[PDB]
Amino acid sequence: ASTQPTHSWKVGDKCMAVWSEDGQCYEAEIEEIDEENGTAAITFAGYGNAEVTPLLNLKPVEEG
Numbered sequence: 001a002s003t004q005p006t007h008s009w010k011v012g013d014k015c016m017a018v019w020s021e022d023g024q025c026y027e028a029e030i031e032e033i034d035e036e037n038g039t040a041a042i043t044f045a046g047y048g049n050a051e052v053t054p055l056l057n058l059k060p061v062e063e064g
């Protein structure tokens, strides 16, 4: 990776992402990870949106 993140995430995993629109964390599933920037593309579960948010902004979920 270009930058090495302390947060270790993989594709197919859901995390909680901070919705850039509301500033809160919602369950979002990681679609793709960009290790170059340390950012991941996530899809908000239920709502069905997707944003590229840094791994640092990804939080661990409960029950998964």
Ligand SMILES: C/N=C(\NC)NCCC[C@H](N)C(=O)O
Residues within 6 Å of the ligand: 019, 026, 044, 047, 048, 049
């Ligand atoms: C991650 N969160 C969302 N979309 C991806 N929320 C969409 C609905 C937002 C609305 N204020 C509501 O809460 O009803």
